[model samples]
Target: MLEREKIYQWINELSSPETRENALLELSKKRESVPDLAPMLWHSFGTIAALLQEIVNIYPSINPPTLTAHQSNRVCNALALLQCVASHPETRSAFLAAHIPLFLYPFLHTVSKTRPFEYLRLTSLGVIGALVKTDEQEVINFLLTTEIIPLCLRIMESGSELSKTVATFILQKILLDDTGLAYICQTYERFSHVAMILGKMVLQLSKEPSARLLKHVVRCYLRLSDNPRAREALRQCLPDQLKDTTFAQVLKDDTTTKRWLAQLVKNLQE
Candidate 1:
């Protein structure tokens, strides 16, 4: 059994700007050994979150140079560990409710825009995915109502391949929920715009070495087209240029998306 004090010591060491990178590398390999150290993980999450909050709160007073690379990396690792533990719905919900969305907002909007921090954006997207998995409608609607959706899409439009992949994953999870689907339609007006945006992204992704991003982008488009309203929106939003693409053809041929959309249409009829 891991003692709470020892766990706190490790977490403190891990949080320090000096030792955090080495500590994270060591901790990543020994995560399974910490089954008895779950509380420590939770505590560490809180500590890192508080530290991030403080940084955000004092942004005007601090210079960018004040934040060391190791400190940023440590926060990213802490967020990744939170995502790992968040696979369980209960744990995920607690993290989401207590610490995540607030912590993520600043990074998604301000921090991401300041510099090219792909890892930070990727981890933030992962946190969004985990939140959606646990409370899809709530989290998705919250994002829709807030700046998160537009901010995410803005990032998707300009982010790195990995960042786009992570953004697409989060989008797919949100679109999986019915309320999320409706919210997207209401928000975007034309469903094809979603597909069109995705199509452009896929084209960009095609230039990358890894096909993984293209695969996830395709999957996200398929999922988004699942709702009838979404399909209707797609037909309305798709530009003439995108309407003729191979990417557009794949969305048309996806059986699961078609079936789900058909069911949604049928529900409206009945």
Candidate 2:
């Protein structure tokens, strides 16, 4: 077993910008070490996230280019590690229920002044996405009913391409939950802007070098459409310019959409 003091010491070292970057880079290869040190790691992750926030608070002018390649890599690494823990069932529930969101809450509210600060924004979005993947209904309801959805939408609207991508990814993940699906359906008119934003993202993805993002956005769209209420909500929210784009056309080529729609049809048939 890892020594508790040793872990804490390493976490303390992460407060230093250099060590934090190094730790993040090293961690990318050491995810297996995570489960053994889950408790200590959680505490450590909380500390790192807090410190990153403080840096952003104190140095609002630092943009993305100011970060050394190593520093940026570490930030991404830390986000990835947290995402792993958040994706798991047990840890994810505890993290959301705890004060982790409080630590992250500020970034959602801050004005974006620079690029490096945008990392904080993206990281928080990743954490939110991770939380939504948990099976706990209470957590899902809390996030949807709370300021998270609006904050996510705002971030999607204001951030760089990368930040928008992360925000959209989180939004997509949240929409997968039935409660979240219902929330979006009920508030479709208010959040109707997302359809145009996401449609643009889909178009951007199709022309890009990576089709992976295209697939993610497409999957999210199909999942959101799976709920009949959500489908209708989308239909209502779609602009007049897109009126010709039928729901049938949206689901036509995607296997996931076909399967989801087919299941719904089967249930109705029964």
Candidate 3:
């Protein structure tokens, strides 16, 4: 039992800046099977605060874009732990109550194409992705009030294929929610803003295709088509590439997105 409780000792090591890196690396691996793990780290003294400090310390490096892969991995390890906390139902509320996700925005805002920045953005998205993975109402509501949409949209436009796929996944989760679909479709400006991005993604797919990325894009459109006016807007704005055989070769094995694409087209027609 004491050996199992060794995590507490690791948690203490995080208090010292000198020992923080190894401690984060160690604790970030304890990813599951421990029911109390999230709360234990969350409620323990200086744990989340220490994690936040690691994130903030990288701010200067972010602006000048001097961060190296080693530095990025260290901070990302800390973020991995945060994702575990965000994934747990018990700790998720406190995670949000602290507004911790907001701290990750700066990393997400980065435009650098280097490995470090891409890893940073992907890891940061994992945290928010964990929160919304469960389809919780509060999680979606909180994100809607924040600038998450635009930040994610920007990443979808610029990040690597994996990053774009994950960012699009986040958007798909939000759209799956009733309120989220409503918010994005409620105004022409909002709908147009999102449509433009999705359209761009389709155009990009024509140049370089990814079944994974295309899946999320189709799902987002399919979800948007759930809204009546959005469906009408889609009939006009839905990319012709999606209507034709452009994605057939890539999507042949992706039955789910393929089904969604068919439904999306059918929805717009009616």
Structure candidate 3, residue pairs in collision: none
TM per candidate comes to 0.68, 0.64, 0.96
Global lDDT scores for all candidate models = 0.58, 0.59, 0.91
* Cα lDDT over the full model 2: 0.59
Model 1: residues >4 Å from true position, as ranges?
A: 1-8, 12-29, 32-38, 43-68, 110-116, 134-138, 187-193, 236-270
Residue 154 CA error for candidate 1 (Å)? 1.4
Return the clash pairs for model 1, or none. 190-233, 191-233, 191-234, 192-233, 192-234
- lDDT accuracy of residue 266 in candidate 3: 88
Query: For residues 58-169, what per-residue lDDT tens digits would candidate 2 score against the true structure?
Result: 3333332344434444555666666666666656766666645655666566554465567667776777776765446777777776657777777765666676767777
The worst-scoring run of ten residues by lDDT in candidate 3 lies at 28-37
Tens digits of per-residue lDDT, candidate 3, 96-181, equal: 98999999999999999998999999999999999999999999999999979999999998899988988999999999999999
Best by lDDT: 3
Q: Kindly report which residue stretches of model 3 are placed more than 4 angstroms away from their true locations once superposed.
A: 32-35
User: Which portions of model 2 show Cα errors greater than 4 Å?
Assistant: 1-9, 12-32, 43-90, 109-114, 158-161, 206-210, 227-230, 233-270
lDDT of 1: 0.58
What RMSD does each model have against the real structure? 5.5, 5.7, 1.4
